[PDB]
Structures are given as structure tokens and as C-alpha cells.
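Subject: Interface between my chains keeps coming out wrong

I've been trying for a while to get a sensible model of this assembly. When I model each chain on its own everything looks fine, but I need the whole thing in one frame so I can look at the contacts. Pasting all components below, labels as-is. Any help appreciated, I'm running out of ideas.
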Amino acid sequence: AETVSFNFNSFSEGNPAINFQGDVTVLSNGNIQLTNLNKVNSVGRVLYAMPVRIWSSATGNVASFLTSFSFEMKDIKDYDPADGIIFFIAPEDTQIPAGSIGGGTLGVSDTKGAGHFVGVEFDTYSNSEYNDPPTDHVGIDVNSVDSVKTVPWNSVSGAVVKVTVIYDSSTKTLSVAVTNDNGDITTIAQVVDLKAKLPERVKFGFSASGSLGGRQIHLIRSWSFTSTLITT
Amino acid sequence: AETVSFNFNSFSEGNPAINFQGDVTVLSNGNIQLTNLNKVNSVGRVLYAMPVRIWSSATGNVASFLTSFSFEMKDIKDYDPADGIIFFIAPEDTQIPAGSIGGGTLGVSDTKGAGHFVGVEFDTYSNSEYNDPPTDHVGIDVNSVDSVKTVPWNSVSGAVVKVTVIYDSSTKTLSVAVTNDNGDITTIAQVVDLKAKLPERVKFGFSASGSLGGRQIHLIRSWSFTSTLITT
Amino acid sequence: AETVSFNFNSFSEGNPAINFQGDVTVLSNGNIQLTNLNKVNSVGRVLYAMPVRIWSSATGNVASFLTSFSFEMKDIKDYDPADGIIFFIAPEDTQIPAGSIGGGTLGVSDTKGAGHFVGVEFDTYSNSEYNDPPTDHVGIDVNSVDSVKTVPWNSVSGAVVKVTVIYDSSTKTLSVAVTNDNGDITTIAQVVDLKAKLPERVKFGFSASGSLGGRQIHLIRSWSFTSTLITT
Amino acid sequence: AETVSFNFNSFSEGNPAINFQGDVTVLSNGNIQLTNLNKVNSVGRVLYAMPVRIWSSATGNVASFLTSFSFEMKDIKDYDPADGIIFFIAPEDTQIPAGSIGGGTLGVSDTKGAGHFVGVEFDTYSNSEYNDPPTDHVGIDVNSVDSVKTVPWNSVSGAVVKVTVIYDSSTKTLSVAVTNDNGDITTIAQVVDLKAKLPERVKFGFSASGSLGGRQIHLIRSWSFTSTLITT
Ligand SMILES: [Ca+2]
Ligand SMILES: [Ca+2]
Ligand SMILES: [Ca+2]
Ligand SMILES: [Ca+2]
Ligand SMILES: [Mn+2]
Ligand SMILES: [Mn+2]
Ligand SMILES: [Mn+2]
Ligand SMILES: [Mn+2]
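Reply #2:
Try treating it as a single job with all components included. I did that and got this:
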């Protein structure tokens, strides 16, 4: 029984359990703000320091994890809300793409839209070049921001959103259940083999980016985590 | 969107929001002791008053729901810790089986271990008659307690456990993630069609049965559920 | 040397192991409920019947003890949560203060809040009448409820809390580490010469007190304890 | 609050959560074995991989921590048991003393007997040079295997121990509570200022060494940590 869990009701520049990437910045309160509002093509990402082992080439067993977080996006004239937020998983050596252009890559892929990540994106700005659907949305991305599957979601300025991902390794089904402002929930799922698209040890994080014409406020609020691996 | 949401920190026998059925009683703090210990073949069930439409035959759309709740199963000599609690989903006119028999029917099935329902059971006694595993577990039950899928679980006496369930209409997946005391977490997932296996309107609830020689305590401590069915 | 250890996962009116006092009552899930909620100025206590010897005058040595216990306190309209639970150590003949008054005495002190005992008080009502910190606090008490040491704590309604308490004799330091629900721990410590405060043999127990305006649910869940006295 | 909890009921090589040093090896049943037998002057350390910041230069606050763990020492024909185990706290960039003699240093101090580290030790071999007591003892070490204070203890071949440590920041009182196979608890405490003896960030871990004449089995059955740091 190999478990790894943690809790964050407020973050802070300092706590080694958390490492920053890009323009993340800690707020007077406790929240985290990924993108910078004055930089062009900004990119921010944040992830748990110590990496997590999600499977053993020894037992072949895959790990199951339960997570949940609360973010919040918010408009800001005269720019356009973009591009959004992505909850990802990446090799223990993941850096913000080389000279990343930011924009709709969500700071996790390259210009073409690819990279070595598996995540959940809360895309608010529909990017043609990546086959985004003409509306805001929740989607599953694998080694590319050209989501494998998506789902009609609605970004609400100032709305405090709440997410809950459940990974059942016995089926390898990634399950996402978003909890909007008003109550309506949005659910998305996609059977993705982690042991096949990711290395033994990986890192869990949050990325958010903006273009030149679009910049929005990206704040992460809470992120509890627990992942158990079985070894026998 | 046609949503339905509620949250219970503690209940009562009066709050018409809850339907009590049988041995079900209510502690002096809000916990719902399902089974009675002095009675043999006891059966406790607590449905959620107001029924919920989980699919419109007109639109074919199946509702998606995210629920999380907490229970507790504490031993009591000289009996056995059987059979356990079950979070089921059954038609709006559902009632404890005609001339029930506690035991491993859990208050949802007949003698043959059959019935009209869908649920996540937390089994602690191996009743070979309905082909159960050899140890405590968590199974997904479809019109039967002879589970469709099982994962080895570990019930702990006087252990506050946490269950989070996500049903994603799109994939018709019933993701289950248990969070035992210590920290380790147990998960099991499956594909259920509800619509296929159920009427448009039903009720969500818990249940607990108790054989002749084996009785135990089944406390339901908290419960939140939010269902939504896109339709328009 | 001479050790005295025990363990309680449940209790039950019909066990010579514990003396009941006040308005105490045992629930169906094996839980000592201190205060009864339909009475003004309620005081129920509970303690190990067999008086334990913490120190002997012949040798001059004091014993060290290790104890852990868990309790649940829960809110309810229309009264306000108070006053709270207190783990205390008193003389072998310790009785509930003559003609109690409830309020911030926790069943150990009188009207002036002073008595013969030494205990840990998980406080929920700021009884300024006894120089109480303006928030749910934690503190060590020595012959009164006008704490020597206090620590901002935070009691969560309907939340299961654990507590480990250490008392080293060589330093006579009372260590206390409260583990809330969410995980963070609140701790407090102090120097206390039991030998100079309490008599050779003393009983250990729990006590909760209510008032006319305010009341709440006091649940003592489990209790294991161990103490060793050097005899040379 | 900035808590950091984890816990292992068993260990496994590779798990990025743990860092192994020296002669450390993991047994086939989840136990770690700090020392090597057929080797001379064996030293074995195991650290919680990720660093925990034990104090903030911003507020000046220390953190409190509640950790408990289980260790076992067994005799091997006809090498005398030596020297013992040590739960320590030291600067993250902590490595095994270059050219460590092992033995009475337990591999956390040099020949002289000093080193930058705080820690509780379960010493079991009279090392005149380090002013150790005449018998198996326990002690709170502060930058020297020459314990600031020790108490009599007793290593029992193949016996499993039970230790609970609590460091209350409000008093800077590190208190330990041992539990011999038989039952007697063993308390010892001391005021160590983890704010003034170490650097904001440290690593926790267990170290075990030996000699040529002295050798033995050191196993660590399970370790569970938790440390909250208030930041406001
Ligand atoms: Ca985009
Ligand atoms: Ca059964
Ligand atoms: Ca008070
Ligand atoms: Ca030594
Ligand atoms: Mn997209
Ligand atoms: Mn079953
Ligand atoms: Mn007080
Ligand atoms: Mn020593």
C-alpha cells in the first residue's frame, strides 16, 4: 500500500512541497495566480514538488488517485478571457515549453499543440488551430492540446468552480466532475492508460496561459490530493 | 439544465426530506443507524424523499450525478460484522423486499439475491450463496448483489470512511472512490446504462441488512448529492 | 515496574470498568454522550473506576503516562455550541461540584471556576468570567478553568477529532497533540508537578458542561491509556 | 496552516517519497534494514525524500509535529548488538559523514562525536568516549551523539517497539513516549529549539550504524509523520 496525499487551503511562496513555473505569484490572501497580466504571451504553472510514482514496471500495477481543486477565472477589460486552465501530469523534468508562445498551448505544449502531458483543460478561448469547439469547455488532452474528448462548459467571471477527478486504474478511466457556480455539474471521462503515456515517476500540476489580446485572472484556491498504489 | 442538489450534515426523523424504512432509527447527533441489533434479519433503508428524473426518454439524455457521503461500521461482540451498507438507486415506488430476509440481500434483493436497482455496496461478510469474494470489498451492483465488479476492501471497526461517486452520462460510468481511515484509498469503476436498467424517475439511498448470527453497526454520518440532466 | 493500561473502542451501561456521573448516557454505537441536551446547566462525566497511582511517597517517584482518545462534538440550532469537553485528572473520590451551575466549569470547577483537578480542556465558549481567550481554544488546567496555557484551536461541528497526550515524569511535562479532521495539528504543552497537585492515587475521566442558553453534543468515541510507575 | 503528513505501513525501493543512504536495503516484506551484517562499520539512513520547512524566517514561528513509528532490533550470533537507531532531523543536504567510522556515531557525527543535527536515539552500547550511560538507553541528542539527556531503557532481541514523538512549538518541548514489547512506557523530554539549531528547511530520517565487534538487525516496521506550521 503506497499512498501519497496532501492538502492546500492556502499556498505560500516558500513551502518546498510546492514549486513554481512561469509567472505564478502568491496573493495577499493564500490563493495562487498563474498568469501575469502585464506580460505578453504569459505562462504560469504550479505543481507538487516531490514527484509521484503512478505505476511499477515491477508489478505492472497502476495507481489510483483522487483529487479535487477550486479555481476561479475572471474577466478584465479591455482584453479577452484566455486561454484557460489545465490540470496536468508530466514527466519529472517538465519545463514551460521552449520559448513557449503561451496562448492556447496552455503552457503545456508547443506551437503545433503537442507535448508530453496528460491533463484536463478548462479552455475558455476557442482556438481554431487546435480544433477547439466554438464554445468554452472542459476536455481531456493527451500529449496534445487537441483534446481527445471535450464537453460544452461555461466559464463564469468571478465564479468559484470546484473539480473532482477520480482515476480508477483497474479500468484506467479518468473521471472529471466539475461543480459550477449555480450548481449544475459538468461530467467528462476518458479511458486513458497512464502506464503507457507517462513514465514511472510523474508530477502533478496546474497551468494557465494568455495571448497578447487575451489575458485573464487565473487563481487556484484549493488542491487536496491522495493517490494509492498497490504492490503485490 | 434540470439539476437536483442537497446536503445533509445531520438528519432527523421529522425532516420530510428523508424517508425511513424499517429498523432505521436516528441517533442523538444526526447519524442514521440503519439496522437494529436486537432483531434478527433486520433491514434498514433511508431513501431520499423527493424522486429524481435520471433520463428523458424524449431526449435519450441520461443525467449525470456527483455524490459523496460518509458512513461507519463498528463491530459488537458476540455477533459478526455482516452484511454491510449499500448505496442504491431504485424506482420511485421502491420498498424493502416482500418478506425480506436481512442477510446478504442487503435490503435491496429477494432470497435469490435479485431486485430492481443499481448501487455501490460495502460488503463485509462473504455470502457464497450470492458468490461474494473471500474478503471485505466494494462491488457495483446491477439488479443483483452478485456483483458485476469487486475490489478487495478493508472495513475497519469504528472507522469514518468517505465515499465519492461520479456518474458521467457521456460514458455511463459510475466511478467509485472510497477513502478508508488511515489514508489509503480504494477505487472501482464500471459501465452502467441506468436508462437501460432503470425508469426515468427513482430515489437514491442507503441500506443495511443483518443476518441471524451476524449483526453490526451501520452509521450514515453525512451526505451530499448533485444531479443534472442537460435538456432543452 | 507497575503499568496500568486499558483500551476502549466502545462502552456500554453494564460494564464495571467505568463510573458514570451526571447526565451521561451511552449511545447505540458505543459512545459515551456526556451532556444531555434537554437540561439547564448539564454536567455529565465519565472515568476509569479503578483509581490509578501516579506517584508513591515511599520511593518519591512519579509515573509517566501515554494516552490517546477521540471525540466528536456537533452543532445544532437554536442554542450555541458550549462549553466543551475536558479530559481531567482528579482525586480518587472526585465528585461533580456541589450544586453545579454549568457554564464554563466543564463539570470540574465551581462557580468561581476552581477545583481539585488537572486536565485538558477543549473549549468552545469564551467564558470571560474565567479569563477565556475569545475563540474556540485549547488549554491545560491546574485547579481551575482559568488556564495556565492556551492555544487558538478550532472545533468543527460533527467532526471526529483525535488526541495523543504524553506526560513525562523526569521533566513533568504534559504534552498534548490535537489532530483535527482536515489533518493539521494543534499542540500545547506545559510543566505540571502532578505529585504536588494531585494525591498519590487519582481517577481519570472526561466531562462536559452546558448552560441554559447554550448546549451541544459531546461524544467521547474511543479511549486507550497506559501509565508506568517506577518502583525503586 | 501548512501541514505536511504522510505515513508508511510498509516500504518499497524506488518510492520517490524515501531517500536511502549507505547500507540501506528493503526486506521482501516491506521492512527497511538500515545496517548490513557481513560489512564492517555499517551505517544506514532513510529520509523522508521531500524536505519539510520547520520554521519561517518571516514570522519567526516554529512548527509542531506529531510522529510515531515502530522499530525492532534482533541479535545475531555472537556479535554484540550495536550501536542502535536514531530518528533525526538535520539540514536537507545531509549525507553520511565522509569516511564515517560508524559505531558510536550512529553515522550522524564524526569521530569526535559531533554533527549538525537534532535527534532522539535508541542507543544500546556503552561508548565511554561519548559519555553514554552504562546500559541500553534513550536520549535526546543535540549536535552530538553525547545526548543532552538520557534515561534507562532496554533493547529486547527481536522485540518490536512503539514510539510517539511530539514537538510542541509553543514551548519548544520535544517529548518522546516509548512502549516496550511487554507494556511499560518510557518518557523522556527536553527543550530543543528547532528554530535555532537547524535551518528553515530540514529532512527527517532514521540512521543506524555498527562496528566490527558489534552488529545487529535494525528494522523499521512503519513510520507516520504530520507537521503543521501556522503562517499568520
Ligand atoms: Ca485554447
Ligand atoms: Ca454479503
Ligand atoms: Ca469555557
Ligand atoms: Ca553507542
Ligand atoms: Mn481545447
Ligand atoms: Mn458482494
Ligand atoms: Mn477555558
Ligand atoms: Mn547516547
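Reply #3:
Confirming on my end. The pocket of calcium ion (ligand 2) is lined by residues B 83, 104, 123, 125, 127, 132 (CB under 6 Å).
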